[PDB]
Amino acid sequence: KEKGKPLMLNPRTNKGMAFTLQERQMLGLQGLLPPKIETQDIQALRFHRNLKKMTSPLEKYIYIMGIQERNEKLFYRILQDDIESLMPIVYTPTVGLACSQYGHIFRRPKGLFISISDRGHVRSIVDNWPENHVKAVVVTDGERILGLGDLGVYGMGIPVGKLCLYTACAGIRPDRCLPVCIDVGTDNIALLKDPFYMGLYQKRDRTQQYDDLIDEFMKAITDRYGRNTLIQFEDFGNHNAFRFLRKYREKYCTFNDDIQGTAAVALAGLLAAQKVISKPISEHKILFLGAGEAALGIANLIVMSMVENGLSEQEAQKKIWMFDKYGLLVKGRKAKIDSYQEPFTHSAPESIPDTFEDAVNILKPSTIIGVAGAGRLFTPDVIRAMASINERPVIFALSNPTAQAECTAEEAYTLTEGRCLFASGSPFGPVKLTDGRVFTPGQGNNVYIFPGVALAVILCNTRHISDSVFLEAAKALTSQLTDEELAQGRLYPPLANIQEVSINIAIKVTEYLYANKMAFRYPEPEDKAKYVKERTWRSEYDSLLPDVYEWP
Amino acid sequence: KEKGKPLMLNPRTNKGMAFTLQERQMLGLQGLLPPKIETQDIQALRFHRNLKKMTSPLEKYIYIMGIQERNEKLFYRILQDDIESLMPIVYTPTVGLACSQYGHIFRRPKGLFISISDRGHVRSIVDNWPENHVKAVVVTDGERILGLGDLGVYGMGIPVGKLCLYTACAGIRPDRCLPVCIDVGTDNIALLKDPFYMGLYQKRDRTQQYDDLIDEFMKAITDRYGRNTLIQFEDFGNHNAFRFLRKYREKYCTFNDDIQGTAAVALAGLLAAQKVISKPISEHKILFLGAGEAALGIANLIVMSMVENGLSEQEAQKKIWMFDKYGLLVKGRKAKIDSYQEPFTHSAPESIPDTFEDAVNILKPSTIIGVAGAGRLFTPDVIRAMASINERPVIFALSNPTAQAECTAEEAYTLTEGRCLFASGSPFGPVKLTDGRVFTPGQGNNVYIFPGVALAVILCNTRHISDSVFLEAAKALTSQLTDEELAQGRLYPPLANIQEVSINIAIKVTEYLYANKMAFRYPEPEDKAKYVKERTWRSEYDSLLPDVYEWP
Amino acid sequence: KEKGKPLMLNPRTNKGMAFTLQERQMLGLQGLLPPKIETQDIQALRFHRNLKKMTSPLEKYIYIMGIQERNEKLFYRILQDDIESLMPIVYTPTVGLACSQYGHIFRRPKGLFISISDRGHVRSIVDNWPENHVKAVVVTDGERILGLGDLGVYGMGIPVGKLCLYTACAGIRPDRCLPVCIDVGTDNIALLKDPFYMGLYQKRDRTQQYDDLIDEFMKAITDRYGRNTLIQFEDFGNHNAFRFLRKYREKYCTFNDDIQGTAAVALAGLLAAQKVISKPISEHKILFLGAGEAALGIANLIVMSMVENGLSEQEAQKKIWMFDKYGLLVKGRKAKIDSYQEPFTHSAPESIPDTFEDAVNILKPSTIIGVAGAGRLFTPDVIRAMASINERPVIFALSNPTAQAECTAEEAYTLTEGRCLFASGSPFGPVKLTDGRVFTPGQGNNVYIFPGVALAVILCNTRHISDSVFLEAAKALTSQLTDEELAQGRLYPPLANIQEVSINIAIKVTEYLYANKMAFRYPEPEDKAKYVKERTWRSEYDSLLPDVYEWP
Ligand SMILES: Nc1ncnc2c1ncn2[C@@H]1O[C@H](COP(=O)(O)OP(=O)(O)OP(=O)(O)O)[C@@H](O)[C@H]1O
Ligand SMILES: Nc1ncnc2c1ncn2[C@@H]1O[C@H](COP(=O)(O)OP(=O)(O)OP(=O)(O)O)[C@@H](O)[C@H]1O
Ligand SMILES: Nc1ncnc2c1ncn2[C@@H]1O[C@H](COP(=O)(O)OP(=O)(O)OP(=O)(O)O)[C@@H](O)[C@H]1O
Ligand SMILES: Nc1ncnc2c1ncn2[C@@H]1O[C@H](COP(=O)(O)OP(=O)(O)OP(=O)(O)O)[C@@H](O)[C@H]1O
Ligand SMILES: Nc1ncnc2c1ncn2[C@@H]1O[C@H](COP(=O)(O)OP(=O)(O)OP(=O)(O)O)[C@@H](O)[C@H]1O
Ligand SMILES: Nc1ncnc2c1ncn2[C@@H]1O[C@H](COP(=O)(O)OP(=O)(O)OP(=O)(O)O)[C@@H](O)[C@H]1O
Ligand SMILES: O=C(O)/C=C/C(=O)O
Ligand SMILES: O=C(O)/C=C/C(=O)O
Ligand SMILES: O=C(O)/C=C/C(=O)O
Ligand SMILES: O=C(O)/C=C/C(=O)O
Ligand SMILES: [Mn+2]
Ligand SMILES: [Mn+2]
Ligand SMILES: [Mn+2]
């Protein structure tokens, strides 16, 4: 709708020297750009050339995330060129590093910021966002950033990172994505004394005003963009996460990535592992390190899988144990146990375990899943214990970023002598044992799930997301694992093919949504695969020339 | 999103001197307006003062229609002050006069113009319309403008007038209405030699390209604004009208005002008359003057009403006869008889009537409906014949504008000595007979129907409009007629109450759409009346002040 | 700059159907305009066709002034088609009728409004004017609108009308003109009780705050647009008029149209008259009816002319007598005599005249100039006296509008039996005496002067305007009168050629400014005629196409 300099200041439209000569002359850009007409290919080459000379990951993050604020098309072409090598820079673990330093590297803001001080005026803030057709929102309050804790407004880096993957992985239109940070204070003492902090200088408001603010936010967002606007909750504290999920899942189109997204990718990993172990469903014993968002989400999904495979909900729940910061969850312990943990809180065993290692030796689980976000809790002894108890132990260290991981791939594969099936939330390179064998660990991170599910739900005009949708996504993800890849130690499809893998999950989920009368997009497409592929946003430059033609 | 002079140049936001002091200072308008702060009441007074001094209707039309291009809010405020006295100026009959001279009084364009020369680039035309969220489109090709014939692009005045009533009558938001004119040429020889003509100087293109163009238009409109965008076809030629309705009613949210809207108001009138005559359903005999869009639409709607009241479709259709420009529609006549007319084409009677008067004296109908758009065909003899055959004859002269009317109120009431029940498409004032009795004729014009139906369909996110919707609208209109008003000779609710009547029809229709699973707006409101009334656009000025508040 | 709808909403850019196909497609207007591509000629025809059907002058004024708010280019094309017939509608007398009813016919505001309530914030008001390169300002406080009196903010019509002539007559760019109204209240009791009044409801502020405001205005205007911005004072009360001229003429580029502009046109008329009377400079006796802005302005210019032709300043002033509302101006009268009148206030004659007729018989003047703004004071007896005293009496009735004129053309020509040389401020058509002789009276209105002077001053970058500039404009106007036109009774060039006349005056004035080291535009052009003609704004449409071209 506008010509001249503004077309170059808006990263959404700016093509740099790729604007053709005719576009420049017709749009008032001639003279404002160097004479040279470039191609996106030359621009990509300039980027990779500069990236090569850079040393630190944070330096690289600043550079490429900056490109998103300069030339959006080029930004995604850059990710698309090699998503695997750029993932650790734009996503975990470096995104965690960027958040902890957000106030120090700040240059331009990204996303919508809503604070408790704006209560009563949230709608006018939403009306300030430039884009008029938002379809996907990723929101956080920064209380549980990865396993890093409370980073307040510095946590806005997470939503922006997630939304980049929406587009890079599933082809969801960037102009229809909206990262949101809800600022109600922070209990991080270091930030409250940091002069570069970008949020309110107050402790977190935990009164009803907090709930009222979230309510106002959900209403404002949907009032402007539609009741079926996808709203993904990310990195909210344990308490708030479940209650907001329960409270809104039936009234809005929403899901929690740390409860349901992580649950689905974990399940996909276990299904892949079972494909190589073939353990009798009755001999499965799962022990969780932690009992929060991820543990409960994963546990509930594992149970649904066992139920649709014979076992009763009750018998399935008995195969799952949890161990949190206070110890094993057993009936009558002094430490609390909420409604969600009840189903997995069993009667105290022969002896009560003091450490996690004791829990492993006493319960003798076949699977160990780390989701405590508290560092190396899967000690060498915990790993050796699992190797002596099981022929093929399954060890999952899902906490992010790297430093918070329960253990590394190198430790898991070595201490088990290449007999375990390992998956981690953050990346670890291939591991070569002294005997020459090479193991390539998979990354059990929800990035394999949310892009594809988000794409399907949006295309199908789904109103509410049921848990079964994530079970279906879990299956669609694992069903893409080729046997040759399992052999190498991969419990998930190669990260290099995350684009195709995400589109395939969306296709499967879209078919599931229509089959179960959960899709409201009319008419129903006959071929779901063609339907999804035709609607994916591409990073190639579009022509900005007005339609000129002679009249007959 | 903009300030300064532009706020005054856009009729949508321009308040004139009604901009408060704070708005002017905060939006950069101080000094661009006189110091005086006015109210809308004062602005309305200025208008009525000036209107009073004007003489000709066309002069008045140019003035008030011009206000819509200067101050939209004030425009509707003015219509709302006295819709009854302004209706004949902004709508029939004057709008017909305006179209005839459109090129002579042209000042500023309104609506979108799509020509056959634009085939292949229609989407680019649709992208030029400034509004982003259109919900209703009224389109014409100007081939059958009222009973005036082919006026080509001069016919754009009709869609503009219709959309004014959408808002003034049913409170549909103006910024969500789009008047469109499809220009593929004109057969009007006078216009092709007129130097002020606003369209292509060529005969009408009646080849497949025309159909292709309309196809491209329907697709471009829905691609930008949504598949459930209400598309009202207005004043298309007979052949094109039915085939476009049949072709699109199942694939788009569309209806034809001349076939379905007129059918509904006509039926509402008959239902009211029956309430005064109480004639045995078996003794009903309806004779149509004309057998096109209106005749066929009305006939089909009368048949549905009879079937839902006992009679079978077969026997109901036998009570309906039609007489067109070639004479009585009888089986085997030399003049064509298409698919739609077949059900009402009977076996030749005892003697074949030559004139309409012969048809009346031979068939002895109890009801006569004029929809020939060809002038005074209901001659004094025709009327006298009806008064001698029926105690209380029903005479409807629905052709517009006034000069095309089959007869006047004065003629109908006088020649039947006040025994008839009369309704006309164009307005006629009260009639006083030599014996002192005063008769107030009703106006059977679709304006009583499309505003209310359009509102309901838009609010309910209806995907397709069935004919039963118009049957329900017909019933909702007639159920608002108070017995006291029927006595006056009113077959329709007072035009002065058009606003309230349209909202009531909308409520009834929305209740019908939900009850028959035709509404897709979720969640379903419990109280449909409160649902409709809360969403009607109002002509009162809104505050344009930015949201300023302190941070606690 | 802009693209799309905005181009059509701004009268400056809007071309209506004259936008070419390429222009529409490249500027995003395709579909927003009827398919027809028109020329300005066709638009001009539409206008004249509509104007013919109209009856009253006020109705015509509203219509054409409304065009300035829709299509500026077309507006001036229309004036140019026939400036002589539209002059009385856009200018005197109709413009006076319009201002007296400005609040009743208001539709859109024009110009900048500065009120006493904005004292201290005048600059921010000036910063709200959209145009960035203003070169001419016409300002009024509405206290002396024509001979109509105090009309307050209703007087804005005058600065708007004057600027129209800046462009229509001298080709001064419209976007570089700014009409301004200074509102400090009004003493007009009728307006203070009018609900449609557009100004502050308070009597005029005659305190130092008024002077402050005017001073703040001059500084604000010059600060944003430049010290050489031409500021034309128009219709200020007698007291303020002189004091502001004297106070600012040496610090800013300013002049008063009622004092200096009127003076130059009157002088030009006298010079023409002398060309047909050849009366010995010694026997010249001028009697003024009134002794304010115009009389003092004219008197001083006449004096300069006589001095430059022999007579000393002292003896030239002796040939000038003035008669105001209290009687003849004689030394020692009870009525005040200010500094400006002193030079023309002589010793009481043998008998002190009581009426103007008595003043004529006693002083026996050869020239009579009416500038009292008080109606028909040149009674039949006054005129008869002049014809009896002189063979070829010179009678000037310069007050406006028509009703305030001292006498009509018909009155002057008949009562003097065609022997007088007449000129009036308002227009009067040809007069035919009973003997068959036809006399065409000239219009001594400053419109023959300010357009040309204004153009010259602007083009020359003149800093201050001396009284001698007006003397040269007076000579420049008169030197264009052909002998044949003198014969007809014309003291001024035909109004129909006002465009060429203004351009010629501008050329003579720029040559004068350069010759007298008053022009600062560098370099100095060698051919002033080519310099002026090349820079006049034209009403023909310009191409809005972006520069598109192929590269080698
Ligand atoms: N690439 C995309 N990224 C985000 N949302 C998308 C994307 N592609 C399509 N959609 C959304 O998915 C929904 C269904 O898509 P579809 O194209 O069938 O609908 P549409 O109404 O024709 O499109 P639109 O409303 O965008 O013009 C729409 O609401 C649309 O906004
Ligand atoms: N040192 C620890 N040893 C065992 N369990 C711990 C330890 N520290 C914390 N935990 C447990 O880890 C769980 C964290 O749950 P929470 O909902 O906060 O996050 P999460 O999303 O499940 O974890 P992740 O960091 O893997 O995303 C809690 O149940 C907590 O008791
Ligand atoms: N006054 C109106 N005129 C025209 N369309 C309307 C009007 N009011 C509401 N609508 C439309 O009716 C439909 C249902 O109304 P509702 O208010 O329930 O929807 P919404 O999604 O909350 O609104 P919106 O999409 O406008 O923000 C919407 O598509 C809306 O655009
Ligand atoms: N002079 C006539 N006498 C009888 N019938 C006529 C006469 N002239 C035209 N007709 C008929 O009137 C009908 C007009 O139908 P068409 O579809 O063109 O318009 P309509 O919308 O039905 O009429 P209206 O002008 O009332 O809106 C045709 O069937 C035509 O044969
Ligand atoms: N009734 C009257 N008879 C004679 N002189 C009058 C009469 N009424 C007013 N005057 C004089 O006319 C003069 C008006 O001067 P003022 O400065 O107000 O306006 P102006 O610009 O000179 O006049 P014009 O109306 O021609 O533009 C005053 O000198 C005043 O005394
Ligand atoms: N047609 C016009 N109407 C009003 N002002 C004009 C017009 N034409 C030229 N001017 C002004 O007259 C002055 C001298 O004219 P000239 O064209 O020599 O100047 P310039 O500095 O080259 O032009 P500019 O500053 O407009 O780019 C300038 O200040 C210019 O703004
Ligand atoms: O190569 C380019 O045109 C852009 C580079 C950047 O934004 O860093
Ligand atoms: O543009 C930058 O690098 C920083 C801006 C800021 O500190 O606000
Ligand atoms: O009264 C007003 O402010 C506007 C009047 C108009 O646009 O005609
Ligand atoms: O003829 C035109 O295009 C414009 C006419 C007007 O603005 O009145
Ligand atoms: Mn997370
Ligand atoms: Mn119609
Ligand atoms: Mn004046």
From Swiss-Prot, chains A, B, C:
The active site is at Y91, K162. It catalyses: (S)-malate + NAD(+) = pyruvate + CO2 + NADH; oxaloacetate + H(+) = pyruvate + CO2. GO terms for biological process: malate metabolic process; pyruvate metabolic process; regulation of NADP metabolic process. Fumarate binds at R46, R70. Homotetramer. This isoenzyme can also use NADP(+) but is more effective with NAD(+). Belongs to the malic enzymes family. This is NAD-dependent malic enzyme, mitochondrial. It comes from Homo sapiens (Human). The gene is ME2.
